[PDB]
Structure formats: C-alpha cells, structure tokens
Amino acid sequence: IVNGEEAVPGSWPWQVSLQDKTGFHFCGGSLINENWVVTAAHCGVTTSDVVVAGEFDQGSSSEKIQKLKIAKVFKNSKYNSLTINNDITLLKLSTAASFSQTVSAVCLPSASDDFAAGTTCVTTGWGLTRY
Amino acid sequence: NTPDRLQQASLPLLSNTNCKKYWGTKIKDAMICAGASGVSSCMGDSGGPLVCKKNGAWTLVGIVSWGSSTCSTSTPGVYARVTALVNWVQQTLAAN
C-alpha cells in the first residue's frame, strides 16, 4: 500500500501472508473460517506455499504466529487468466487455524448486498509502499 | 522490499461505469474499483482484503487484484468483486 499507515498490531485478524518455501511474502489472503482462506487466483498458490496467520511484523521472531500448511487449492473455474476476471482462489488448510485475539474470520457478504460508490472502506497488506 | 509491518489505508469505492473512464473495457462485472484518492494497493498486496463495515461487522467486499503498474495514487485499483463470487465460495465449502 502506497501512502497508507501502520496498523495496530492484531487489529486485522483475518489478514494472512502467503509465503513460499523460502519465506518470501508474495500475496495476502483472508481467513473466512478456521479451515479456509480466500485469496486471488493470479497469486498462483501451490500446496508447497505456507499460510502465515497472526503476523504483524515480518521482521520479528517473537510473534506468536501460526504457519499453516495448505491441503488443496481451489481456483474458481471461471477465472480468466487473460483478463484477470473472477480472480479468486480458496485454500483448504491441512491444519486448522486456532482462533484467538489476533486470528479470526472476516464476514462474507450476501450475493445481493449493496456497497455504494463513495463508501469508505479499508484495505490492508504487506505490499510495496513505494514503486 | 515489502514493508515489515502490516499497512492499512482507507479509500472510497467507485462505480464500474466511472472506473471505465480510467480502465475502459478491462473492467468486468466481477470487478470493483476503489481508490484514486491518494492511496493505492500495490504489488504484494494481491489476494488481501478490501473490507467495508456493514451492520457493525467488517465484510469482505473485494480481493486485491490489479491496477496501475506504478501504483499511481490518482488511478483506481481493481479488486475482485466478492458479491459476484460468493455463491461459488459457498458451493465449494459445502462440497469439500
């Protein structure tokens, strides 16, 4: 995020980091329950990648994080790689997350819910802060 | 390269019709645009949440997807529109 600010630690408890086996953060995701993470299809997750829950500072060794293995990757069958449309994948975890003060789920909308233009929302992540 | 500490930003939703002034025919019905407000999502944010409060609870409205190759803060970012995708989520969870 360019021109954002640091979050309060633990205040976005559904936010996960997707890391490869070398420990490199490459995408975010969101917990929707103890067993399932939502992310983007174009992130290209495999079962060799790791879901890291409960993280705030990726440079700290002292945080009580959960490193969760991925059992199966469910890419939406309507994902179109040419247009990047329907850009959603579900990850089924091999090991359930343990919910706590710093790890818990985001709500899903109903298909008929309305979010009007002009509404102020929030996004979070460990993406670049400058290009 | 990526920040060590988790970042946040508030930003407004756009309509798809208005987002098309920036991105043209690249904007599909399963996308929602947000930003152009002095902040931007950027590389490494992909897959993470765009949440809006609804009846007191944070609700997943978008999944960070794509946008400007320079993360321009005057151009809207593009997010996967979760309302268009939630039936597939529910079907997948129920079957697995």
Binding site: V8, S11 | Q8
Partner: peptide, 10 residues
C-alpha cells in the same frame, strides 16, 4: 465474523 478483538484505529 468481522468483529476484531483488538479494534482497528483508522
């Protein structure tokens, strides 16, 4: 869902 134990500050 959707109600963090540690409230965000925006």
């Amino acid at each position: 869902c959707g109600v963090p134990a540690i409230q965000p500050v925006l």
